[PDB]
Amino acid sequence: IIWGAYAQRNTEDHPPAYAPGYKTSVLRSPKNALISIAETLSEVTAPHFSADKFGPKDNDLILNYAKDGLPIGERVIVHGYVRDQFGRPVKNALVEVWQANASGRYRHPNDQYIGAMDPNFGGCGRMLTDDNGYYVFRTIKPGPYPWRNRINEWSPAHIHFSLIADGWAQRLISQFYFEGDTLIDSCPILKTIPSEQQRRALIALEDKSNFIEADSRCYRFDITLRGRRATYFENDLT
Amino acid sequence: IIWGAYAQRNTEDHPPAYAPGYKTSVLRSPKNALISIAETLSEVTAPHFSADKFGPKDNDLILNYAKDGLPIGERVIVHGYVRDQFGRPVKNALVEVWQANASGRYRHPNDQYIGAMDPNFGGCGRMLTDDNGYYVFRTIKPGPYPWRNRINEWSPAHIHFSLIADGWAQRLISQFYFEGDTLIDSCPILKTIPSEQQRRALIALEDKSNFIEADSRCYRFDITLRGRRATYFENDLT
Amino acid sequence: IIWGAYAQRNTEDHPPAYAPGYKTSVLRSPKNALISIAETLSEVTAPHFSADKFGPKDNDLILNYAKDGLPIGERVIVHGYVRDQFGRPVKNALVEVWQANASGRYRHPNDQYIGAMDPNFGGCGRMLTDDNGYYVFRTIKPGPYPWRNRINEWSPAHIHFSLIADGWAQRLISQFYFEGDTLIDSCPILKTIPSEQQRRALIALEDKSNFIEADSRCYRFDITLRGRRATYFENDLT
Amino acid sequence: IIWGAYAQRNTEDHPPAYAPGYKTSVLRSPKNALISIAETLSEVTAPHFSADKFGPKDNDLILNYAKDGLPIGERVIVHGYVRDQFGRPVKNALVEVWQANASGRYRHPNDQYIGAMDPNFGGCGRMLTDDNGYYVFRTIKPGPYPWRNRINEWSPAHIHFSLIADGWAQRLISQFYFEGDTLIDSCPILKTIPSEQQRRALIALEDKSNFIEADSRCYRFDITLRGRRATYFENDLT
Amino acid sequence: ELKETPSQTGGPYVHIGLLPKQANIEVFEHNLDNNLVQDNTQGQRIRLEGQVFDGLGLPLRDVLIEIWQADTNGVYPSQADTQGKQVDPNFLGWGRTGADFGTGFWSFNTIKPGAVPGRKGSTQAPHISLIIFARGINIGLHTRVYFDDEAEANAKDPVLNSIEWATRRQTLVAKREERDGEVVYRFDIRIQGENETVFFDI
Amino acid sequence: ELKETPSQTGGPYVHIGLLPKQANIEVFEHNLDNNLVQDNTQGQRIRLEGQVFDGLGLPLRDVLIEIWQADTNGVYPSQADTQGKQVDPNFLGWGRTGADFGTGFWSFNTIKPGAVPGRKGSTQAPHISLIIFARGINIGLHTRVYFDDEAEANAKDPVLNSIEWATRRQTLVAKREERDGEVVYRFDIRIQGENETVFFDI
Amino acid sequence: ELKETPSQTGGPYVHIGLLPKQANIEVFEHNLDNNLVQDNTQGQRIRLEGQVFDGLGLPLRDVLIEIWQADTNGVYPSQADTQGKQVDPNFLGWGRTGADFGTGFWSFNTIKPGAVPGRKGSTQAPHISLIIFARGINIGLHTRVYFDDEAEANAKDPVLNSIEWATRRQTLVAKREERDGEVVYRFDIRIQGENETVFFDI
Amino acid sequence: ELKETPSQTGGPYVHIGLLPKQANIEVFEHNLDNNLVQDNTQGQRIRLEGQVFDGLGLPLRDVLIEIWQADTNGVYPSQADTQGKQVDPNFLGWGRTGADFGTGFWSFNTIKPGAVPGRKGSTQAPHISLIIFARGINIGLHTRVYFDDEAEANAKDPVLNSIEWATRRQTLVAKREERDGEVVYRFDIRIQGENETVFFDI
Ligand SMILES: [Fe+3]
Ligand SMILES: [Fe+3]
Ligand SMILES: [Fe+3]
Ligand SMILES: [Fe+3]
């Protein structure tokens, strides 16, 4: 198999840069249209991270920052598969995640919300997907939180995530929400996404058969990245 | 106005005593049918509690047990109206509430769930309804929790409540859930209720216009008790 | 009752500042997003106007400018209620109105439309709402008129109105239309409103039971302003 | 992969022990609720049976009891896959089957139905599933039969089956029916199953492409057993 | 018209909200309890005690009980009492207790109530209204406690006579005992099985 | 719950209903105007004036402006003021004016307001709340006017400090001038473009 | 995800498929039976016997029983056993039998199992897992058999201690007897009624 | 076929997950950073620094930047590189940094990349691929950094020549400076307005 370029990003499946309902995008979006280029080796390559450097608790947000007890909050496992748009598994991709604690408070110098800080919770983790594209991490479910867009804006609970995979063109940062959160229908950041089916692609689903008795609930969330086409005739990449 | 008896409890609007899906009801339900009686002064009277005895923080579960900081979790206000079945407001009724903390852990000697205890949260409060039947309290939203019925049983988040109002016949204890919780469709205790419309009568609704910016969300939950009929002819109560 | 801030204005329920179909908005709309602030005493207070200053004909547009006869046109009474978003009546609010005459001609130096001027009609009135939030005025129904947006633009008949009520945050100017006017479906100014249900909130309804025989028709039009939340815990307004 | 416990049996997907329409269940069902336990090595292990002990005709009910001719009746092949609830194949599981002959008569001392016995048919077989979870056996289609529940009760044609697989918790005995049998809608034993979709999970389907010309028809029937969850954090099984 | 909010079990942790001191939570200054006798309360002091048993004959160690009763003259301390009589001013008429976690015993300190008017001019025998809440119990179970030393009044009681299976009437009569000076009435409640206690839909 | 009635532009003829004298209509005996100073009004008299410019830098010659402010002691003449302080009894706190049809200039005669409490115990710097209505403007635009001679108070103002793009804060400060005895504050509003004035959603 | 195939009663003729020799069908050369002891099997030989009774106290004469147990060192002969210990190589760990058609008696010849690890580092007392299938029984009923001569180990067993109604724990203890040299454990199962045997959802 | 998961802004707290040390969280032993130079890394060491400005010309003080580049011989340290050449074994090719919270300055320590093959036999001029994530930015913005001392190679670069508005090509050229021995390339990014930096859809 000789790989060709990644399929073009479908701009209609993502939010636009300029989205006036999310106020800070007004001064942080370009006025010019993006310039599309034909891909080169630069766009189809990406770095490799070795599992050797990762700690044993890097994907366990319940224990990785715990000092003298456990963090307060709802114990949950999140797992799923990362695939490319042609359904192929994405192997050894770097998944980094971050989130607020159970109060909706982020452990960050710029977050001064009154929601209480939890001395035993940090809110960040990472892991590499396996050969089947599978990933799993454990954490405390985050609480929704208020932020200033309109004065009484509130975001539904969410976990932020980032992926660095096989090609630089696949680079993506997004966030997923939890099935049934009533704030999903009100969020201006989620509403920057044009279509209802793509807004639904960010909702993690309750996975009841995988709950662990007297311990933790479980949510299922799959991620899809751009995929490469195979070449059978001229290969102009180089 | 001369008051007569309370209208009969509609047994089809409540769970049955024997409900095999909730295992502990099998040995704790009578085998005989209840004996219905005609009401007397005993059933239409009830005690009166004075607001004088209540503390200033008795309806503030965020601060009433706080020692050296705030409890961890989602800040929420819950409010609503208590009415009788004929729509009349229920005034000066005693509403007592209790719940688990943000981890789904109850502050009780018999709860040993691994969900973490929160040193600044107690989980109980009380208040009297006002002349319009209105009540309001503030708390941390409780987390769902596992319990042993089937081995992997989980209850959706809920706040337990109790009401002592104008007549002993109105005595009621129940619990309300939060709009959108996906565990509501799976709970064997909620499923002891026969009808879908009554299961829905226990769901508190998101009240977005009453959220407090950069502070707390708000849920609306009304409660309906049995009501007395007025008498215009013979009054046989006495 | 201790009042807290007004609920946040729902921007999705109003037109956007920039609406290219209404041409003059292109150079008169800010490019930056509005900055939302937390309310202070400045935003929750407003002036008080005394009924003592008002003339006996200030709400009677049929007679308040009449000199040697009555104005020509369709005699109509318009009445309704002003409430806040929580349904509470808005008492003693200043309602000011203005409109074109029966020809669609405004009594203004800058209106040169060929529709004829009516020597006995002025086109402005005012009144204060009563304790139930009720208001009533009498006038001549205005005629629709052409204006230059696209060259053949026509607006359906409408009466402009302004309200100064209890808080500066409630300050509002809008206009209402009359049930059945076919131009309502074509107006670019009405189409700046996003949703169909809000466009319908500006339509006054025929109120046949309140027509006065051999005299005047009647239209019903209610107005809703922003409402204040009550506070039961911390009061940070001051 | 470190295996954890089997997912909990969903009691709502099976018949209840007490089902008064199946009369013999009235005295053979416990009055107490089952006690759910957390699984140990005892519940997740099971015996292994070697294919070496099995005869060449153990899965051929047409020939395994034939003495001086072939059994009378409809020649059919039944095949399918055994999977766990997560879709994984169940390998080397022991499947044992039994059934009445073409007359609806069982070869058992306690069956005295007038339907004729067939000297060349026994009615029992067994096989182990292969690595893909596949199984196949050949037999004579059984006839429906009368039995005493109500006096004129009749069961649709069925083949009884039993599975011993990887964990004792998966132990199951049931029976499957044949597509289109009109008695399926009347059977009190099939009606002990609560839901229509689970009643349908016991119906074997006609598999026309797999019929063998001038020889035998074919039915397709898959079986699903409980499945184990994988563990990625604490493993408390031991 | 509206339907009553449906009942749900109080559950095993009902103590947190209704008897916090039993769950070791000190958050209220005034705590509701099982002592209905104040220093100036009128009437004869009595102790009411017993256990609640399940269908296996085992006691419920997590049950919560409340009682409601009239004062010594048979007047209820409620605005809904229409007798036009003055009620004892130092009497709440209600109390709440929880069974002990290890033994299942429960008790109340109260006074023996006076007789209360029944319907249509009748007189009810002295009684205390009692309700039970616990894990496994979906709707609070209502019953009444009558006194064995009021046989004459019990024989004429309208509610007891309204139970047509006469042998069951005795499950509602508590037994008087005198533990060195103190009068005690023992009332065991059997939720299910033989001698099952009568429960009412009131 | 109900949704707020949606806004619509006041349009080019807004004067008819709100400033009839500017449209040459005499129908009211008492006309609302731009003079907030009565003979007994307390405080220092100041004149507030400026122009409103569109995106081409041209003035709006049909804009209508209103202002709302506290008295000299920072008390609002509104029942919603909770300071418990007596307000100047000869002060409406509000006025309305229209830009001149030929030049676009607008002005108000008022007094310099005193400082008003902010949230959570803070103090706001002296300011006047202002709103703009005109053809082309779909919803009245809210802004505030602060005074350049109150630099100390402005530097600590909660609302000004809540604007994270600091360079924009200066668009809200009017410039003090003294036209022979009279104190004048010039405040030009730029709806769009460079140095665009900050507008608030209040 | 898929739902488990629903259970159905094995019915009165379950012997045809699972114990053909009891239904007088000779079709298999190797027949599964109730003898778990092979010549080289390690451990003490014991006989397990009893009857299964219905709600009228009558024995089930058509019930089929299977048992699953560890070897003498408490290791299961299953690939799913994770102890890392060698299991007795001459032990299947499972057997099946049917009650006699006339008396309802059933028995197994097996060995007494060794203790098996429980969860979280605990140790379970010696036990045999048992399941019952029969006409009238819609889903096989699971129970466990413990031994009365292992009182010390039974008192610390996690599963027995997880039954909160303590009086029911004794229904799971079989009684040791010694029929001239042979050790026999009698375990009667009562499906319904008084002393009903505990059944588990495993 | 599946659709790509939609992008969402990284938000103001993106540091928690991607640069925890900047948010004062010590939880990882190995932290990803902005230093791509290891002791044995080949090539000339250079520093890349600048600021990212918004539409008001103010710097973004919460932006996160990553870069991806080839080694000194123009080979990428990725299995997807098909040149058949050996890559520097002591070079990750990627780094991540965050703008300083008070000044908005960001920098990387890396080496100057060698030229990489372009499509159809062409040669690309030396460049570094860069992406920007921040509050207000819904999808990471991709751009490239070229070097002003490679004018000859830049004039023939396929991607730069594919920008038809030639005046915009210069926004992608960083300026070389030499801070006492060290080579520094200054590359300021202007998200919006005059001299807006070219962003690519790659
Ligand atoms: Fe976030
Ligand atoms: Fe609960
Ligand atoms: Fe108009
Ligand atoms: Fe059968």
Q: Please name the residues in contact with A52: beta carbons below 8 A apart, sequence gap of 6 or more.
A: none
| Pairing, β H182-186 against β H173-179 | antiparallel
Bridge partners (DSSP) of residue C83 are: C89, C224
Residue B169's Cα: distance from chain center in Å?
16
Bridge partners (DSSP) of residue A65 are: none
**CATH assignment of the domain containing B112:** 2.60.130.10
Give helix then strand counts, H and E, for chain H.
3, 11
**CATH assignment of the domain containing F158:** 2.60.130.10
Distance CA H66, CA C158 (A): 57
- Under a CB-based contact definition with an 8 Å cutoff, are residues B78 and B139 in contact? yes
Phi then psi dihedrals of residue F98, to 5 deg:
-130, 150
- Under a CB-based contact definition with an 8 Å cutoff, are residues E114 and E126 in contact? yes
Q: Please, is A141 exposed, middle or buried when counting C-beta atoms within 10 Å of its C-beta (0-12, 13-18, 19+)?
A: buried
Tell me if H191 and A29 make a contact (CB, 8 A cut-off).
yes
Q: Please, is C27 exposed, middle or buried when counting C-beta atoms within 10 Å of its C-beta (0-12, 13-18, 19+)?
A: middle
SS3 of residue H131 by DSSP = strand
Instruction: Enter the tokens of residue D211.
Output: 């019929």
- List residues of chain B with CB under 8 Å from any CB of chain G: 27, 150-151
Distance CA A121, CA A108 (A): 12
Distance CA C176, CA D193 (A): 62
Residue F113's Cα: distance from chain center in Å?
12
- Under a CB-based contact definition with an 8 Å cutoff, are residues D44 and D238 in contact? no
Distance CA B47, CA E94 (A): 6
SS (H, E, C) chain D: CEEEEECCCCHHHCCCCCCCCCHHHCCCCCCCCCEECCCCHHHHCCCCCCHHHCCCCCCECCCCCCCCCCCCCCEEEEEEEEEECCCCECCCCEEEEECCCCCCCCCCCCCCCCCCCCCCCCCEEEEECCCCCEEEEEEECCCCEEECCCCCEEECCEEEEEEECCCHHHCEEEEEEECCCHHHHCCCCHHHCCCHHHHHCCEEEECHHHCECCCEEEEECCEEECCEEEECCCCCCC
Phi then psi dihedrals of residue C183, to 5 deg:
-75, -10
SS3 of residue A155 by DSSP = strand
Sign of the C-alpha dihedral computed for residues F69, F72, F76 and F78 taken in this order: negative
* F199 interaction partners in chain A (CB closer than 8 Å): none
Q: Which chains touch E (3 or more CB pairs under 8 A)?
A: B, G
CA distance between the termini of chain D: 16
Instruction: Look up the domain containing G146 and give its range.
Output: 1-202
Write out the DSSP string of chain C.
Answer: -EEEEEPPP-GGGS--S--TTSGGGTTSS-SSPPEE----HHHH------GGGS-TTTTBTTTTT-SSSPPSS-EEEEEEEEEETTS-B--S-EEEEE---TTS--SSTT---SSPP-TT---EEEEE--TTSEEEEEEEPPPPEEESSSTTEEEPPEEEEEEE-S-GGG-EEEEEEETT-GGGGT-TTGGGS--HHHHHTTEEEE-GGG-BTTTBEEEE--EEE--EEEESS--TT-
Tokens 């209850």 found at:
B155
Tell me if H138 and A15 make a contact (CB, 8 A cut-off).
yes
Distance CA G70, CA G42 (A): 11
Reference C112, options F25, F13, F98, F59; nearest CA is F13
- Under a CB-based contact definition with an 8 Å cutoff, are residues E20 and E98 in contact? no
Bridge partners (DSSP) of residue F98 are: F64
SS3 of residue G154 by DSSP = helix
Distance CA D88, CA D227 (A): 8
Distance CA A238, CA B183 (A): 54
Tokens 């490319």 found at:
A84
Distance CA F36, CA C2 (A): 30
Compute the distance from residue D157 Cα to the ligand 3 centre, in Å: 81
* C38 interaction partners in chain B (CB closer than 8 Å): 213-214
SS (H, E, C) D124-159: EEEEECCCCCEEEEEEECCCCEEECCCCCEEECCEE
Q: Please, is B91 exposed, middle or buried when counting C-beta atoms within 10 Å of its C-beta (0-12, 13-18, 19+)?
A: middle
Distance CA C90, CA C167 (A): 11
Distance CA C48, CA F80 (A): 10
Distance CA E65, CA E21 (A): 15
Tokens 């026994």 found at:
D122
Q: Which chains touch A (3 or more CB pairs under 8 A)?
A: B, C, D, F, H
Q: Please name the residues in contact with A91: beta carbons below 8 A apart, sequence gap of 6 or more.
A: A129, A130, A131, A132, A133
CA distance between the termini of chain E: 21
F14: enclosing H helix or E strand: helix F14-18
Distance CA B139, CA C171 (A): 35
Distances (CA, A) of G130 to G134, G173, G188: 14, 13, 12
SS3 of residue B131 by DSSP = coil
Q: Please name the residues in contact with H168: beta carbons below 8 A apart, sequence gap of 6 or more.
A: A32, H196, H198
Phi then psi dihedrals of residue F160, to 5 deg:
-60, -40
* G168 interaction partners in chain E (CB closer than 8 Å): 56
Phi-psi region of E84 (alpha: psi -120 to 50; beta: other; left: phi over 0): left
Q: How many alpha carbons fall within 13 Å on the CB side of residue G105?
A: 7
Compute the distance from residue D159 Cα to the ligand 4 centre, in Å: 7
Q: Please name the residues in contact with D213: beta carbons below 8 A apart, sequence gap of 6 or more.
A: none
| Closest ligand by atom to H14 CA | 1
B9 touches chain A (CB under 8 A): no
Distance from CA of A33 to the nearest CA of H (A): 8
Tokens 């509610």 found at:
E159
Reference G193, options B17, B31, D29; nearest CA is D29
Compute the distance from residue D94 Cα to the ligand 3 centre, in Å: 85
Q: Quick count: other Cβ atoms within 10 Å of Cβ C150?
A: 10
Distance CA C136, CA D221 (A): 76
Distance CA H107, CA C121 (A): 72
Tell me the resolution in Å. 1.8
Q: Please name the residues in contact with E55: beta carbons below 8 A apart, sequence gap of 6 or more.
A: B26, B27, B28, E191, E192, E193
Q: Quick count: other Cβ atoms within 10 Å of Cβ E181?
A: 5
F110: enclosing H helix or E strand: strand F106-111
Q: In total, how many domains does chain A have?
A: 1
| Pairing, β C145-147 against β C134-140 | unpaired
Q: In total, how many domains does chain H have?
A: 1
Distance CA H174, CA H154 (A): 12
* D37 interaction partners in chain G (CB closer than 8 Å): 159, 162, 200-202
SS3 of residue A167 by DSSP = coil
Nearest CB to B201 within list E3, E9, E16: E3
Reference D87, options D15, D161, D7, D10; nearest CA is D7
Q: Quick count: other Cβ atoms within 10 Å of Cβ E26?
A: 10
Reference G99, options G142, G28, G32, G50; nearest CA is G50
Distance CA C103, CA C118 (A): 8
Residue H67 sits at the vertex; the CA angle it makes with H64 and H70, to the nearest 5 degrees, is 170
SS3 of residue E129 by DSSP = strand
SS3 of residue A41 by DSSP = helix
Q: Please name the residues in contact with D155: beta carbons below 8 A apart, sequence gap of 6 or more.
A: D144, D145, D147, D183, D187, D189
Distances (CA, A) of B71 to B63, B103, B122, C233, H125: 8, 11, 9, 16, 58
Q: Quick count: other Cβ atoms within 10 Å of Cβ A194?
A: 16
Contacts of D103-109 with CB under 8 Å at 24 or more apart are: D103/D143, D104/D142, D104/D143, D104/D144, D104/D145, D104/D146, D104/D157, D105/D143, D105/D145, D106/G13, D106/G16, D107/G16, D107/G23, D107/G24, D107/G25, D108/G12, D108/G13, D108/G15, D108/G16, D108/G23, D109/G23, D109/G24, D109/G101
Size of interface A-F (CB pairs under 8 A): 3
Q: Quick count: other Cβ atoms within 10 Å of Cβ A7?
A: 16
- Under a CB-based contact definition with an 8 Å cutoff, are residues H195 and H168 in contact? no
Alpha helices, DSSP H only, in chain B? Answer: 41-44, 196-200
Q: Quick count: other Cβ atoms within 10 Å of Cβ D186?
A: 13
Instruction: Enter the tokens of residue C21.
Output: 């179909």
Radius of gyration of chain A (CA): 19
Phi-psi region of B180 (alpha: psi -120 to 50; beta: other; left: phi over 0): left
Instruction: Enter the tokens of residue H192.
Output: 């919006």
Phi-psi region of G161 (alpha: psi -120 to 50; beta: other; left: phi over 0): alpha
CA distance between the termini of chain A: 16
Instruction: Enter the tokens of residue C164.
Output: 């100064």
**Is D6 marked within a binding site?**
no
Contacts of G186-189 with CB under 8 Å at 24 or more apart are: G186/G49, G186/G50, G187/G48, G187/G49, G187/G50, G187/G130, G187/G145, G188/G50, G188/G51, G188/G52, G188/G53, G189/G50, G189/G51, G189/G52, G189/G53, G189/G132, G189/G143
Q: Which chains touch D (3 or more CB pairs under 8 A)?
A: A, B, G
Distance from CA of D14 to the nearest CA of B (A): 13
Residue A12's Cα: distance from chain center in Å?
19
List of E strands, G3-121:
45-50, 52-53, 64-68, 94-98, 106-111
Residue C57 sits at the vertex; the CA angle it makes with C54 and C59, to the nearest 5 degrees, is 80
Distance CA F106, CA F98 (A): 6
Instruction: Enter the tokens of residue E159.
Output: 């509610």
Distance CA C31, CA H55 (A): 11
List of E strands, A87-157:
94-98, 124-128, 134-140, 145-147, 153-155
Residue E149: DSSP 8-state: G
- Under a CB-based contact definition with an 8 Å cutoff, are residues F95 and F69 in contact? no
Bridge partners (DSSP) of residue G161 are: none
Cα maximum dimension of chain F = 55
* F195 interaction partners in chain H (CB closer than 8 Å): none
Reference E80, options B228, B134, B89; nearest CA is B228
Tokens 């609480």 found at:
A143
Instruction: Enter the tokens of residue D36.
Output: 């759910």
| Pairing, β A35-36 against β A75-84 | unpaired
Distance CA F163, CA F156 (A): 12
The F residues from 138 to 197 touching C (CB cutoff 8 Å) are: 138-142, 158-159, 162-163, 168, 191-193, 196-197
CA distance between the termini of chain H: 21
Distance CA E42, CA C231 (A): 44
Distance CA B192, CA E6 (A): 10
List of E strands, A17-152:
35-36, 75-84, 94-98, 124-128, 134-140, 145-147
Reference C25, options F136, F59, F192; nearest CA is F136
